[PDB]
Protein backbone atom coordinates (compact mmCIF):
# COMPACT_ATOMS: atom_id res chain seq x y z
CA UNK A 1 0.00 0.00 0.00
CA UNK A 2 1.42 3.35 -1.03
CA UNK A 3 -0.40 5.18 1.76
CA UNK A 4 1.02 2.91 4.45
CA UNK A 5 4.42 3.14 2.81
CA UNK A 6 4.19 6.94 2.77
CA UNK A 7 3.37 7.11 6.47
CA UNK A 8 6.05 4.60 7.46
CA UNK A 9 8.65 6.37 5.35
CA UNK A 10 7.78 9.68 6.97
CA UNK A 11 8.08 8.08 10.40
CA UNK A 12 11.25 6.04 9.79
CA UNK A 13 13.57 8.86 8.72
CA UNK A 14 16.40 9.10 11.23
CA UNK A 15 17.22 12.73 10.54
CA UNK A 16 19.83 13.65 13.10
CA UNK A 17 20.80 11.20 15.86
CA UNK A 18 22.71 9.24 13.23
CA UNK A 19 25.77 11.14 14.41
CA UNK A 20 27.70 10.48 17.61
CA UNK A 21 26.82 12.25 20.83
CA UNK A 22 29.87 14.52 20.71
CA UNK A 23 29.18 15.34 17.07
CA UNK A 24 25.47 15.99 17.57
CA UNK A 25 26.14 18.26 20.54
CA UNK A 26 28.77 20.19 18.59
CA UNK A 27 26.32 20.63 15.73
CA UNK A 28 23.62 22.03 17.99
CA UNK A 29 26.19 24.32 19.59
CA UNK A 30 27.26 25.86 16.30
CA UNK A 31 23.66 26.21 15.16
CA UNK A 32 22.77 28.15 18.30
CA UNK A 33 25.94 30.22 18.06
CA UNK A 34 25.20 31.26 14.48
CA UNK A 35 21.62 32.14 15.34
CA UNK A 36 22.67 34.23 18.33
CA UNK A 37 25.37 36.03 16.35
CA UNK A 38 22.82 36.97 13.71
CA UNK A 39 20.21 38.03 16.23
CA UNK A 40 22.32 40.27 18.50
CA UNK A 41 25.08 41.57 16.24
CA UNK A 42 25.76 45.29 16.42
CA UNK A 43 27.65 47.86 14.35
CA UNK A 44 28.31 51.47 15.30
CA UNK A 45 29.32 54.79 13.85
CA UNK A 46 32.94 55.41 12.98
CA UNK A 47 32.79 58.89 14.50
CA UNK A 48 30.69 58.18 17.62
Amino acid sequence: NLTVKLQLQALQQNGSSVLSEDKSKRLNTILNTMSTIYSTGKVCNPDN
Partner: protein
Protein backbone atom coordinates in the same frame (compact mmCIF):
# COMPACT_ATOMS: atom_id res chain seq x y z
CA UNK B 1 32.12 40.34 20.88
CA UNK B 2 28.41 40.54 21.73
CA UNK B 3 29.07 40.80 25.49
CA UNK B 4 29.98 44.43 26.06
CA UNK B 5 30.26 45.68 29.65
CA UNK B 6 29.99 49.23 30.93
CA UNK B 7 32.22 50.57 33.67
CA UNK B 8 29.84 50.88 36.60
CA UNK B 9 27.85 47.67 36.64
CA UNK B 10 30.45 45.20 35.51
CA UNK B 11 33.99 46.43 34.92
CA UNK B 12 34.71 47.73 38.41
CA UNK B 13 33.09 44.57 39.68
CA UNK B 14 35.71 42.46 37.93
CA UNK B 15 38.33 44.83 39.26
CA UNK B 16 37.00 44.67 42.82
CA UNK B 17 36.21 40.97 43.20
CA UNK B 18 38.23 38.92 40.73
CA UNK B 19 41.42 37.00 41.51
CA UNK B 20 42.36 36.08 37.93
CA UNK B 21 45.50 37.85 36.75
CA UNK B 22 44.50 37.56 33.10
CA UNK B 23 40.96 38.87 33.57
CA UNK B 24 42.13 41.82 35.63
CA UNK B 25 44.75 42.64 33.01
CA UNK B 26 42.15 42.41 30.25
CA UNK B 27 39.76 44.78 32.01
CA UNK B 28 42.46 47.27 33.01
CA UNK B 29 44.03 47.41 29.56
CA UNK B 30 40.83 47.49 27.54
CA UNK B 31 39.18 50.26 29.55
CA UNK B 32 42.13 52.57 28.92
CA UNK B 33 42.64 51.42 25.34
CA UNK B 34 39.05 51.68 24.11
CA UNK B 35 37.66 54.60 26.12
CA UNK B 36 40.80 56.37 27.28
CA UNK B 37 41.94 56.96 23.71
CA UNK B 38 38.72 58.77 22.82
CA UNK B 39 39.32 61.41 25.49
CA UNK B 40 42.83 62.46 24.46
CA UNK B 41 41.97 64.87 21.60
CA UNK B 42 39.19 66.30 23.74
CA UNK B 43 41.38 66.80 26.80
CA UNK B 44 44.05 68.54 24.74
CA UNK B 45 41.46 71.14 23.74
CA UNK B 46 39.90 71.31 27.20
CA UNK B 47 43.30 72.33 28.61
CA UNK B 48 43.71 75.21 26.16
CA UNK B 49 40.21 76.61 26.57
Amino acid sequence: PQECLLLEPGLNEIMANSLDYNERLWAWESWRSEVGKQLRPLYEEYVVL
